[PDB]
Amino acid sequence: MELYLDTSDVAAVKKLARIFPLAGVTTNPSIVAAGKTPLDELLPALHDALGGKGRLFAQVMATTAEGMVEDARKLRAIINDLVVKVPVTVEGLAAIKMLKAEGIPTLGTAVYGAAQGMLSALAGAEYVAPYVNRVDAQGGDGIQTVIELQQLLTLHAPQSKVLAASFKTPRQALDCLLAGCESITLPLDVAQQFITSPAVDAAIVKFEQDWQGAFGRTSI
Amino acid sequence: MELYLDTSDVAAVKKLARIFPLAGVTTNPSIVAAGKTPLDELLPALHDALGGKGRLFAQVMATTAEGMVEDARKLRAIINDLVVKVPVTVEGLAAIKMLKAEGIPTLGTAVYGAAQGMLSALAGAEYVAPYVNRVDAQGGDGIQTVIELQQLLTLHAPQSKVLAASFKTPRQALDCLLAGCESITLPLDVAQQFITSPAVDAAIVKFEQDWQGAFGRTSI
Amino acid sequence: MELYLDTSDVAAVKKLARIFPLAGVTTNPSIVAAGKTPLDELLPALHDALGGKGRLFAQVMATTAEGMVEDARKLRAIINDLVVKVPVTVEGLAAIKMLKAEGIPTLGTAVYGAAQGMLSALAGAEYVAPYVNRVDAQGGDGIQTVIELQQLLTLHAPQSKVLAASFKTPRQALDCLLAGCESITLPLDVAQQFITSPAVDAAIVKFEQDWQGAFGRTSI
Amino acid sequence: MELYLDTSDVAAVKKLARIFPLAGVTTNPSIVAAGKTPLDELLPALHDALGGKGRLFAQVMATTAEGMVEDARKLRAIINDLVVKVPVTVEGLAAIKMLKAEGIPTLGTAVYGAAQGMLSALAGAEYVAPYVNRVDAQGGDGIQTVIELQQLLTLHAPQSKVLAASFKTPRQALDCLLAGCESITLPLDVAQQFITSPAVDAAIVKFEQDWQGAFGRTSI
Amino acid sequence: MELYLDTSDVAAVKKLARIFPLAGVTTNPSIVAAGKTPLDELLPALHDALGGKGRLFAQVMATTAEGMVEDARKLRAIINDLVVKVPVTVEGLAAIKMLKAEGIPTLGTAVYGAAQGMLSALAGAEYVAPYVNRVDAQGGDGIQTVIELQQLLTLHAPQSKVLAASFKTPRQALDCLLAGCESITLPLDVAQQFITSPAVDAAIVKFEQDWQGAFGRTSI
Amino acid sequence: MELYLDTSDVAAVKKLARIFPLAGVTTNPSIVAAGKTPLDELLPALHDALGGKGRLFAQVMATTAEGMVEDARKLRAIINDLVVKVPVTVEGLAAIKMLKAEGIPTLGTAVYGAAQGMLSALAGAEYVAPYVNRVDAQGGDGIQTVIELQQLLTLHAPQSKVLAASFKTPRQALDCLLAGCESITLPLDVAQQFITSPAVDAAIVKFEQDWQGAFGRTSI
Amino acid sequence: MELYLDTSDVAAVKKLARIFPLAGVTTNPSIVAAGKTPLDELLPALHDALGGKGRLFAQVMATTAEGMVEDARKLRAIINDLVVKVPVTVEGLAAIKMLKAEGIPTLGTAVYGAAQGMLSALAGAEYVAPYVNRVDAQGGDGIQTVIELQQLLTLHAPQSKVLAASFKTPRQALDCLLAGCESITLPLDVAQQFITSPAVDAAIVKFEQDWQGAFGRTSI
Amino acid sequence: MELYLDTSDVAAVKKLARIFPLAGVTTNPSIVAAGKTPLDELLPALHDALGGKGRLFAQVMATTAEGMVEDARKLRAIINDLVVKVPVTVEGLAAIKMLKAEGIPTLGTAVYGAAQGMLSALAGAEYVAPYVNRVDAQGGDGIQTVIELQQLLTLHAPQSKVLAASFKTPRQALDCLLAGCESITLPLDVAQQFITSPAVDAAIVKFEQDWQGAFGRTSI
Amino acid sequence: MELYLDTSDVAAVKKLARIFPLAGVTTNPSIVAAGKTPLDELLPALHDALGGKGRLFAQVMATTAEGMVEDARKLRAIINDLVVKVPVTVEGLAAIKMLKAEGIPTLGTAVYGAAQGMLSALAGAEYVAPYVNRVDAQGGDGIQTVIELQQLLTLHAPQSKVLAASFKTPRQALDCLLAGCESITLPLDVAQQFITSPAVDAAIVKFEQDWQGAFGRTSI
């Protein structure tokens, strides 16, 4: 399993990198924009925050296949372990094919349907990123879309992975993991919710009280 | 997965060949008739449009097995590596057996039922093409027919593939791919609908807006 | 059950009114445009084609609730038995509420999700029209959307009906009827596919041959 | 439940009328042709064979709606209370509407699909007859068609009944009855198989043997 | 619910009549033979064993419908609350119809299939008795047969009841009751197994021990 | 259906009251705090924003039952149509009983499990509010919790309603509505997402373009 | 997959051997009798009709195990590639064991239950032939029996194959193939129904018309 | 598959050993008692009845582990291929561990629940024998118990087999075999029922009559 | 499978170690407290009670990652084959990573949700212990949490095992084992319930009696 954070918050990555077993960080244009730091600075900072390891993802902005290939080269020049995110559009599919021929790894992003996602894998994308919450938000069934996508890759493009993205609640991310997605990228709030629990905290308090009751101390 | 277009539109094939990872082009008599170009012109033009590679399919017209074998030879003389489509009828089954012995690859076409389709595979067809929408349109269940056919081939003729055909909506094609079909042929309209999305377009607009807001341009 | 045709083709309505038990005709802005005939001419012509009876639907064009109410009154002034189609948007929902207060019947249209649909019913729409094929075409599950919508209306707004729309194959329409939709509108092509079948034609030919064999005529 | 025989064999009807609780007899053109007896003789002979009661069904032969209406009149003159079978075609639907207005009961016959069958009920048919075995024989799913049709009638035309027809095995007829069909018509062979059983015969032999062993006779 | 014992053991009936809420006793020719007491003696003895109440069942032995009607009259003359068991055969169905006309209540017995059973209800039988264990014993699915039969009566003959019979294990009888059978007849061994339990006995022993431990007595 | 907003944002309620068919507004202590307006001002302001109608909900703050009853009376006096939210704790249940006897309507809030929810209804609560997203966020299954709660109320307290609350995505709210919840309260973000759609927006654009094409204007 | 015909009709075998990929022909005592030709003439004639190849099956007639072994040797002396059908009875199972020891291949026939079938496989039969339609006809569920039998062989005797037999409709045979039977024997009527379809015929007519329309001939 | 008889009836074993492919015979204390022959005579007699081969099972009688080990050694010395049945109790589990360490094969018997059964396998038992009918008879679900036991062994102790025991009807035994049990022991009555059938008998009669009809004899 | 006891009751462990095939003993702070014996004395006593073998588990008490590492080393210093239980919190996950690097085996404890559990495995924990009954007791679904966890480990962290913990009834433990947990820890009461049964006791009593009746003794 590859666990990613979906963020441009370098300090938060550093903090969480000692907690979670992170595979790296994913970005998208909005996430990059929120942090107000250009990629030529952000990407090496994230690399450092991870402990000088991990895989980064960053997205092309161009609207032609040729322009997207140019963007991909620029991104790959910034840092070594970098997968290029390409929106799965007409021009984006064409770009994914060209990038396959050139040996630049890609992720098919902005996926709102299973067939669209499968096409990006067949075209050469190593990862396919459905926008789970966006599908939920717009009156669809994001988890069903993930289940279908994962089925398509398993059947038809088994070397490609689902990288599930776009979460507002832990349950969405859990459901993606149960569907078999081999990679996932979490926003910071959902990531933290996985490891915050009133039930767990209460269990620990009770253990401490019992221990103190028996031994007159809270330590071994 | 082998992804085909179901078309005689040479210019459309050239355009989409740089977008999709195409395995080739399928034709049938109505499709060839629509484009008004005879096979001896059309098939080389398709081969060219694909980039001088790919797998073409064309259908016999004769009604006797011996006639169908003669047609198969004529078609193979036009395209030496073409796969010959044979309707799965009494004489069509007889022809498929003869063509197996002769070493000419076949597809069993005009399949409206699973058992009919299985029989064509057992006779030697490398592909079996159910007419999904035609079964749907005539008050049956095209997807159920495909599921059954796929089950039969998996159980009883695993060297043969389903090449699902006849589509009016992306959902039909998606369902066939979910059912495990190892090949599919799409009409131009359905193919384009897979990679056309208001939701995807809006996501990209938003990414551009957010990028511009931060950095004053929509280029990397 | 209310069976509608989804068309501006007056002659085809007259032809099919004899065959189907039609409740009326639905239109939308594209359908009206395709027919080239403005509503003040079209709607009376449809009324006549139906045999001077039936229910007609036509859609507002304005983008503000006030403007939509003005359109509704205009539309109602053309034709007595007219239900006004209102797009289920922010301003559309506002208009549906106002039209309920005024006692003008409405249909909530351009529905791509069940919750959106249900909201239009709660706001006062007598009908809710999911765009089945458009949901299918954009990588969703139009039939699942219809099942959900119908469930919501049955549970929460049982005085409102689904009027299923947007079809490319009989199977979609069949699946909507099986889901319990109490009204449906068919394009001409799908409507005619319901009632023309090679299997049925062949059965009737066989009957005629057997009758001729025994009695030496094909008539009673 | 209304149980019919599907036959032109007058002597067989008389025999089975004392065994089964028959509601009447259905015919179709092939069945009438098989017995070589014209309708004006056959239908009164059937009515007699049933005990001068019961409901008879016979099919029109004309191909225009007006012709079918004329046939219906002719059939009703032979048997005043007969139910007229009309193939569910374009002209057949038109005829069913006309016959509804005239007050002549109809059955919509030659139904190979659920939606086709539903349309006949909505047009006025009191019964709808799917051809179960014919759908089975042609690579479909007859029982699934019946289940769908029954669902449609229950939802959308509950005053109309399914009269399931066309059987090669008791299992098909059983499945139709389990599906909720409120009427059925059996060929003689299937009907007799329901009430013929090696297991039942052996049970009775054993009862007789046991009785004789104790009491020295096989009479009460 | 009507709970019957399937026996000719008068003393056992008396014993169990104060334990179970019995509706009566069923017999068949083998059961009668085992007890070596003719019906003219057995039936009044059973009536007495029940406490001078309850419903009895006894089976005809004749092989013609006319003979079965004669037997039925003889049986009804023996005792008032008597339902006549008729094997569901060709002649048995004919007899059931005649007995309906004459107002003598019947049960359709020796039922090994759902359709056969349903026919006996339609013919007039108030009860239908499938031979559950016999169907199981001969490589069928007795419980499935009961489920199907109960479905047929519920749908098609709701005034008739299933009287489930022929048991070797409580689980069979339980499964019949869960399927909705409104009457059942138990052999003595299975009846007793329902109310014999090592777990129950152990629970009671433990209650007694606890009580003695607290109060020094085993009584209130 | 009763549709609430879950907010203290008076201006936002005023805006959305003309869009949605609101039953009223729910508050909780955090939501009230975020607005920084005390209830004795907020509740009349919300009443007015709704159009001087609707039902408001507010939560007690005391931790003893007697304290909670005092809170209840105080809240009721601020505005007529006011249902008192009581946390389903030990003291909360005691307070709900007391409030039933006084005839003050209550809602049992802070529900994280079905049995807890049911108990509040049995004690007299008219509504029970599961915290769907909170259950999801802490590693449980919020929707399953709602399904079970709804089942318990339908079986055991059918006079009580589920008022589903706590949402981060439209899909959660939809799933609650599908589960049968007869009331729901939405945060502003989720409410707005129900009626925001790129697909709907694009549909309306296309209509406008088609209309303009035919008629030379975008109005009727 | 092994596809057999179940027939004694030599000319029909020769005709169909050209069309189907036949593994051989099965016979039973009734089939042989119907053809009027004794086995010592029939079996060589079938061999020739198949093209001097294929596997033949014929059934013993004796009622003792010793007699069945004598029949098997006689049958094997007629034809080299011959599998001896043995009824799965007490003496049949004894014979199957003896024939295994002698190295004569067997098929366990007249199977009406899964356990009975499995026993024949365990005793040494290479094939087990359930009588699908006979189970259906006598009020059972022949397909359920086949599913169970196939499960038993897969689990407990995987070297043995189901050879599904006894068919009145294509659907039964289809369902057996879907259940995973690795061999099947078809009567002539059902075999031919698989490969003749009004829908298929109509498709090929349309192709021919469209081709003629464009190219002014119906040939390539 | 290992097929056992559950009996002490030597003559019956001799008879059935030539019919069924037996793996051997199981005994228990009650079955041994019923035969009134001590094990030191019975076990060699059974060995001979099987043909001087096969695997025998016999149960310890001691109630301490040490006692049970002594019983085990004694049983093993009577006959080579002997598996020792040990009741899965507190002392039985202890004995099973000890017998594993000594290399004496065991079966864990008197199993009435899946977890109990699993524990015996983990302790070293090669077989685990659930008492299917006893669980059924005491108001539980024997087949479900077997399904769960089989699941536990497959997951957690795959070297161990279920040896399903305790049967009153063929259906119980069939259901165990369908659940995957790799061994089974049948009482004589149930064993015989597997291979007794009125339907099979009637099939063979009909064959004989048809053969006689054509050929003037009942032999080949 | 690894079977543990969840206890600090040294004498009970010694007693049960000869009955069950134990892998060792688990403790937690409450269980240790309950025994009133410090770890430095308890853990060697438990080692001895197991027979000087097996694996022990004990929990850290510190709240920082650095403190938890210090505790881990302290615990390893007491007992050789000891796995350190670490609560799956923020600091716990950090500690699990550190302990993985150092090669000290860990178990991720206090797991109330599947994703939380999976994270601990990904961080390096060899075992993950969901608190089954604690989840059940707080209104969740402990078994569903275990099913989800086991799926997550199987898919995403197959080297890690579920060690199911926290039981009030055998059914919970059984359900965890059915879910495929590869290790489990039982409290004493549940462990003993698995292997004590009135039904089993009664069976053995009846065996003894039958044996007595035949052989005039209860022993082999």
Protein architecture, described:
Chains A, B, C, D, E, F, G, H, I: One of its GO terms (cellular component) is cytoplasm. This is part of a larger assembly, with 9 copies of chain A (220 residues). The first copy, chain A, is α/β, with parallel strands linked by helices. Chain A contains 11 helices and 8 strands. Chain A has an 8-stranded parallel β-barrel with strand order 1-2-3-4-5-6-7-8, surrounded by 7 helices. The longest helix of chain A is centred in the last third of the chain and has 18 residues, at 198-215. In chain A, 65% of the residues are buried. At the B-G interface, helix 2, helix 4, helix 5, helix 6 and helix 8 of B face helix 9 and helix 11 of G.
Q: Descriptors for this entry?
A:
eight-stranded parallel β-barrel; alpha/beta; 11 helices; part of a larger assembly; 9 chains; 220 residues
Helix content of chain A: 40-55%
Strand order of the largest sheet of chain A: 1-2-3-4-5-6-7-8
> How is the biggest beta sheet of chain A arranged?
8 strands, parallel, barrel
**How are helices and strands ordered from N to C of chain A?**
EHEHHEHEHEHEHHEHEHH
Instruction: Measure the end-to-end span of chain A.
Output: 35 Å
Roughly what fraction of the amino acids of chain A lie in strands? 15-25%
Work out the helix count of chain A.
11
The quaternary state of the protein chains shown equals: part of a larger assembly
Largest interface: B-G, 47 and 33 residues
User: Which structural class matches the secondary elements of chain A?
Assistant: alpha/beta
PDB class: transferase
Keywords: transaldolase, transferase
Entry title: X-ray structure of Enterobacter cloaca transaldolase
Chains A and 8 copies: Fructose-6-phosphate aldolase
